[PDB]
Design a protein around this ligand. Structure first.
Ligand SMILES: Cc1ncsc1-c1ccc(CNC(=O)[C@@H]2C[C@@H](O)CN2C(=O)[C@@H](NC(=O)COCCOCCOCCNC(=O)C[C@@H]2N=C(c3ccc(Cl)cc3)c3c(sc(C)c3C)-n3c(C)nnc32)C(C)(C)C)cc1
Ligand SMILES: [Zn+2]
Ligand SMILES: [Zn+2]
Ligand SMILES: [Zn+2]
Lengths: 631, 149, 105, 111, 79, 75, 100
């Protein structure tokens, strides 16, 4: 009635304990009271005052376990080809009983066992004894009957899941061996033969199927077999060998039949083959290197289609076909790849590489920048029969997709700058806000150091209005001429600053200029103006006929026409002395006046010489009073 | 060895605060692994100490040589101070098991040459003889750190 | 905080925890959950004084400093049989043996 | 001149209170704390200590007039360590380095 | 005169005395708005030396220092 | 002959410096083509500082090379 | 509210102690007893009979269970566990037997 050491008789207590142990191993019925009582009895034997008896208890438990195991490997061997069912039934009980027995030997494990053939705890001893039971029968006979059942699963009927799964899981229970090999017995006993058999079976099945099928029917069957293998491995094996089995099957089949799909990969790509490309990709992605060849044929297809669709013809009069063709090709194949191949940026990179060579063709100077710039300009003109406000931006949004592929950004910049100057200095742009959007797009696509001398042109064309308003407001502080002036930033616009020849300013237009430099110096210091006389236009109403003839001409024409004001006949020497222009410029302006038939040479000399004398035509007539030269 | 102190030669300021009902004795590990003791602390006291970064302190009981908890762990390696502030050091009783608590009480009440006259079991005789040791604790922590890495 | 008690009747002891804000009708309910007696017949007694229904433990004289887990308090229990209460009676524990010679100071 | 010498002394002190002289100048930042440092004979042997924090705090008050007081304070602060410690010591080496720095910047004294 | 002129238009290029550069603070052209301005008229500031700077940039920095970012000499702000 | 140097603002400019001229001469040329005095200058070539008192021929500078210009540095 | 998650422990002298199951599972031996052949079912009462532990030791063990559950993983101060000097040997035996 106390926890004090005593003197106890072993055999009575040993028998009373051995009665209960057998009822625990076989999962029999034991009352609650005995279960609680035996804990006191073990403690009593473990702290006996003279010569404590724990070694004897360990030795007597080892003999009981060995006898039970040896007897079980008599009644299981005597089974006559029904080993599996008996094995599982005798394993469930032994496992649930070996778990419970350890909870009853707690004091011995804590005190005596864990203080020191090395001794083992009870739950580690029982599993070792069952491992000894698993040495002789389990390997040969039961591995044979385990492989046979899984082979029979490949068709036929479905054997019982519980028995096979339990027997497979039995080999994992070496659990109390946590040192660099918790799952080595399992592998060495079962996994290698299983892998070898799987390899042989799938090799032969693949050969048989390839013997009597084409390349189209091969892939669906392979996919179905792979899905079945994946869904059956989860039902039997331990969750550590799925990848190995699937990998070995894929390797065997595809690698053994590798140089047979690279033969039809060419043909499927060239035609549509919507349902075959996906099947090929899904079973070629996971096997070594099969994608690169498909990459190469896709690239070749893109190159061939692009050349056949662009380099054939362009109607020789219309540049909007290039962009439409490239955009259609790009959109169609992007949709195809996204729908079938599910991204796989390798193929997108191949598509980009092929379109780059398609767009930048050069026959043995590329025309791509010229056509792109002309497309932009004609799209941005005022109107012939063109689109509407929210259509130009819509097309230019997709235009940059074609734009990124060109390799010469400099030439496109040059041509766009020239044509932008031409469009701006004449007020023929459709909408002034559109250029801002185009500049923003080009800046977002290329960079800030690429559109600066386009943004500055925009700003100048916007600020010229305010500057003109300021000058016209602060002028009154008598000129006779309506004055609107554009102020431009040199070093950005593509205009030649160097004059061709010395030009004398017309006398009637000598006050406006001087007043302008006066004002500009007064309100803007540090600036050196330069004049380009070959961009300025003037208006004159002639007063020598009966109709109000009004004409618009250039500055050189202005000066030459003003020269005649003194007398109706003037020689070449007088004009050369008065204007001091070169012979070429005077010749060009005289020819321009002759083509419109304003003057006629006095003599029969068709050319121009030192003695060239000209007189204005007496009776020029025009249906339209207002006109512009070579309009 | 492995557990030792490094001559970082950088100052650090600490505050040893005691919140246990027992006396505390700090021990500092030297540069070769030979521990050295330092003056004791009364219960419920806070003492300001000057140390170096990367040194090893361990806190024990004054007479019973029992272990206590600092910052809810076993060791204490100081770190460089920031914002010109000192770092606290809590000392707290670990929650002993009943066997260890009873062993401590019995050791206190019984002379160390009177054990084998008690009416107890045989193993408790050597269990009472197994005194706590800073050397044993340091050894255990050495393989604990080795197995951690 | 939390106070700890030892509800005791004859040889039965019940361990529980409670807050100072709880009333008698939270110990009565636990005694019901364990013993299943008449719900309105558990006269709870402390020392030799009766406790009312709605009055809290803090009013009765329970504090968290003297009802620690290492040493809880004691509240008696009395059930009603034949429409009359039984007199309170609690049986003491055992007694320890004589202290051995070796441990004497 | 007062302004000149005071500004120069403040500059020298702040340069000695720098951010990368901490290799050999961190001990002198604050008063010597014998209780938290473990010393017994320091208070008895060294009657007068000195330090940068007290120097600066007195500087922000009307207590320092001539730079010779600051020089004497610096010399006292170094001589205290030279007196207390043995010849070969880490504090001896670091105090000697800081003393050479002070000697250079005091030969560079604008007066 | 034999005829009368009514309207005239002209163009003229120009350049600074000797200068071409980019603002070294916010890396936008001299003839462009600030990043601070872009979040929504500020002029262009110059120096005694040949540095074209940016009015908002140079003001926000002259709130602290004086000298050029490239010339740690002085600031003029006159011309 | 001709080399290339990059400025701090993003532009690039070219100079005609023979492999016999000194690095001080290159610094002076950069200063007159820019607004940076030689005291606040530093040259980077293959991630190596160029000493003021040397020449191009000592550093094995080949044709059409480029150099990075950065401001003065200290530890 | 009220529950039956309380175990019942009986001493040698005939005292019944009613303790929460989570508190009781601190002991390894009690866990072993309550986890095995002998588990409860139906309208049964959870009981464990200790015929070798008197009342004045089992009450101490129950109070230790309460103390350990209360003062575990707590940032507050942990007070010492008191042990009377005339029960130390019995408490040591019971702690060794109950693995706690
Ligand atoms: C009250 C208390 N509570 C329970 S124990 C305790 C307590 C605990 C620790 C201490 C002191 N701490 C130590 O001794 C530290 C703890 C641990 O990290 C080891 N340790 C050491 O100091 C060790 N390491 C070193 O000392 C490093 O080697 C340097 C040479 O040894 C110097 C011995 O003197 C230490 C006490 N200081 C002095 O004697 C003079 C003082 N030292 C220094 C000094 C010394 C060296 C350096 Cl590199 C810089 C400053 C000093 C100052 S002011 C100041 C804030 C300091 C830290 N100072 C000036 C100025 N002039 N002299 C000084 C050891 C064991 C070798 C002594 C005092 C009380
Ligand atoms: Zn700026
Ligand atoms: Zn601005
Ligand atoms: Zn400057």
């Amino acid at each position: 009635m106390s926890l004090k050491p005593r003197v106890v008789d072993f055999d009575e207590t040993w028998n009373k304990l051995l009665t209960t142990i057998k009822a625990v191993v076989m999962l029999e019925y034991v009352e609650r009271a005995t279960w609680n009582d035996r804990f006191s009895d073990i403690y009593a034997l473990c702290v006996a005052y003279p010569e404590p008896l724990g070694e004897r208890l360990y030795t007597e438990t080892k003999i009981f376990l060995e006898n039970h195991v040896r007897h079980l490997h008599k009644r299981v061997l005597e089974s006559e080809e029904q080993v599996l069912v008996m094995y599982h039934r005798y394993w469930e009980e032994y496992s649930k009983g070996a778990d419970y027995m350890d909870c009853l030997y707690r004091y011995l494990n804590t005190q005596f066992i864990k203080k020191n053939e090395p001794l083992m705890e009870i739950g580690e001893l029982a599993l070792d004894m069952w491992r000894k039971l698993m040495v002789e029968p389990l390997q040969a006979i039961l591995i044979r009957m385990l492989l046979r059942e899984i082979k029979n699963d490949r068709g036929g009927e479905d054997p019982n899941q519980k028995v096979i799964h339990g027997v497979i899981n039995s080999f994992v229970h070496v659990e109390q061996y946590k040192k660099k090999f918790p799952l080595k017995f399992y592998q060495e006993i079962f996994e290698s033969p299983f892998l070898t058999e799987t390899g042989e079976y799938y090799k032969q099945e693949a050969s048989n199927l390839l013997q009597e099928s084409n390349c189209s029917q091969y892939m669906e069957k392979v996919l179905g077999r792979l899905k079945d293998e994946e869904i059956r491995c989860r039902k039997y094996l331990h969750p550590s060998s799925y990848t190995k089995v699937i990998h070995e099957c894929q390797q065997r089949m595809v690698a053994d039949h590798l140089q047979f799909l690279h033969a039809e990969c060419h043909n499927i790509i060239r035609q549509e083959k919507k349902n075959d490309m996906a099947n090929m990709y899904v079973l070629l992605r996971a096997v070594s290197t099969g994608l690169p060849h498909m990459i190469q044929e896709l690239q070749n297809h893109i190159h061939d289609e692009g050349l056949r669709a662009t380099s054939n013809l362009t109607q020789e009069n219309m540049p909007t076909l290039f962009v439409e063709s490239v955009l259609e090709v790009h959109g169609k194949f992007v949709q195809l790849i996204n729908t079938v191949l599910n991204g796989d940026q390798h193929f997108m990179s191949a598509l980009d590489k092929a379109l780059t060579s398609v767009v930048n063709y050069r026959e043995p100077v590329c025309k791509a920048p010229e056509l792109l710039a002309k497309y932009c300009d004609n799209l941005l003109k005022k109107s012939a029969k063109g689109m509407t406000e929210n259509e130009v931006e819509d097309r230019l949004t997709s235009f940059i997709t074609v734009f990124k592929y060109i390799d010469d950004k400099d030439v496109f910049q040059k041509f766009y700058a020239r044509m932008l100057a031409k469009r701006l200095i004449h007020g023929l742009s459709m909408s002034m806000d559109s250029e801002e959007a185009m500049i923003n797009k080009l800046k977002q696509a290329c960079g800030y150091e690429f559109t600066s001398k386009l943004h500055r042109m925009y700003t100048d064309m916007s600020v010229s209005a305010d500057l003109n308003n300021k000058f016209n407001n602060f002028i009154k502080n008598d000129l006779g001429i309506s004055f609107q002036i554009y102020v431009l930033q040199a070093g950005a616009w593509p205009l030649t600053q160097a004059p061709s020849s010395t030009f004398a300013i017309p006398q009637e237009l000598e006050k406006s200029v001087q007043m302008f430099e006066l004002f500009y110096s007064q309100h803007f210091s540090g600036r050196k103006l330069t004049w380009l006389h070959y961009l300025c236009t003037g208006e004159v109403k002639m007063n020598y006929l009966g109709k109000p003839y009004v004409a618009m001409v250039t500055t050189y024409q202005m000066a030459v026409l003003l020269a005649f004001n003194n007398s109706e006949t003037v020689s070449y020497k007088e004009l050369q002395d008065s204007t001091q222009m070169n012979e070429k410029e005077l010749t060009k302006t005289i020819k321009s006046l002759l083509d419109v038939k304003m003057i006629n040479h006095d003599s029969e000399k068709e050319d121009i010489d030192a003695e060239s004398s000209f007189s204005l035509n007496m009776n020029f007539s025009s249906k339209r009073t207002k006109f512009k030269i070579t309009t | 060895p492995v557990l030792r102190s490094v001559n970082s030669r950088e100052p650090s300021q600490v505050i040893f605060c005691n919140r246990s009902p027992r006396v505390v004795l700090p021990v500092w590990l030297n540069f070769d692994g030979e521990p050295q003791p330092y003056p004791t602390l009364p219960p419920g006291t806070g003492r300001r100490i000057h140390s170096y970064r990367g040194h090893l302190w361990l806190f024990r009981d004054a007479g019973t040589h029992d272990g206590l908890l600092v910052n809810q762990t076993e060791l204490f390696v100081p770190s460089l101070n920031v914002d010109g502030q000192p770092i606290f050091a809590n000392i707290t009783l670990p929650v002993y098991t009943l066997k260890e608590r009873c062993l401590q009480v019995v050791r206190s009440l019984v002379k160390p040459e009177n054990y084998r006259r008690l009416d107890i079991v045989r193993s408790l005789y050597e269990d009472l003889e197994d005194h706590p040791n800073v050397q044993k604790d340091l050894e255990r922590l050495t393989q604990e750190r080795i197995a951690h890495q | 905080m939390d106070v700890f008690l030892m509800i005791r009747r004859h040889k039965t002891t019940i361990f529980t925890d409670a807050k100072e804000s709880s009333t008698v009708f939270e110990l009565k309910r636990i005694v019901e959950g364990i013993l299943k007696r008449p719900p309105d017949e558990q006269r709870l007694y402390k020392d030799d004084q009766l406790l009312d229904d709605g009055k809290t433990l803090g009013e009765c004289g329970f504090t968290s400093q003297t009802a620690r887990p290492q040493a809880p308090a004691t509240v008696g229990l009395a059930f009603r049989a034949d429409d009359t209460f039984e007199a309170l009676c609690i049986e003491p524990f055992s007694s320890p043996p004589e202290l051995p010679d070796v441990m004497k100071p | 001149k007062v302004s000149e010498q005071l500004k120069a002394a403040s500059g020298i002190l702040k340069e000695m209170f720098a951010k990368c002289h901490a290799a050999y100048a961190w001990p002198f930042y604050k008063p010597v704390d014998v209780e938290a440092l473990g010393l017994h004979d320091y208070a008895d042997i060294i009657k007068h200590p000195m330090d940068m924090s007290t120097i600066k705090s007195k500087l922000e008050a009307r207590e320092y007039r001539d730079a010779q007081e600051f020089g004497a304070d610096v010399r006292l602060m170094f001589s205290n360590a030279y007196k207390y410690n043995p010849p070969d010591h880490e504090v001896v080496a670091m105090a000697r380095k800081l003393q050479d720095v002070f000697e250079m910047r005091f030969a560079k004294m604008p007066d | 005169k034999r005829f009368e002129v009514k309207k005239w238009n002209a163009v003229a290029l120009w350049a600074w005395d000797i200068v071409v550069d980019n603002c070294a603070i916010c890396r936008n052209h001299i003839m462009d708005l600030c990043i601070e301005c872009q979040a929504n008229e500020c002029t262009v500031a110059w120096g005694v030396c040949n540095h074209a700077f940016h009015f908002h940039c140079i003001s926000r920095w002259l709130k602290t220092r004086q000298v050029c970012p490239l010339d740690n000499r002085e600031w003029e702000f006159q011309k | 002959m001709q080399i290339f140097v990059k400025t701090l603002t993003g532009k690039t400019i070219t100079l005609e410096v023979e492999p016999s001229d000194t690095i001080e001469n290159v610094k002076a040329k950069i200063q007159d083509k820019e607004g940076i005095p030689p005291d606040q200058q530093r040259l980077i070539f293959a991630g190596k500082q160029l000493e003021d008192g040397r020449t191009l021929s000592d550093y094995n500078i080949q044709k059409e090379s480029t150099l990075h210009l950065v401001l003065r540095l200290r530890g | 509210g009220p529950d039956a998650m309380y175990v019942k422990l009986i001493s040698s002298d005939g005292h019944e102690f009613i303790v929460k199951r989570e508190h009781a599972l601190t002991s390894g031996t009690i866990k072993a007893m309550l986890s095995g052949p002998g588990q409860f079912a139906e309208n049964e009462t959870n009981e464990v009979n200790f015929r070798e532990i008197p009342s004045h030791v089992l009450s101490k063990v129950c109070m230790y269970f309460t103390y350990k559950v209360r003062y575990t993983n707590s940032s507050t101060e942990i007070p010492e566990f008191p042990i009377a000097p005339e029960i130390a040997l019995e408490l040591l035996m019971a702690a060794n037997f109950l693995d706690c």
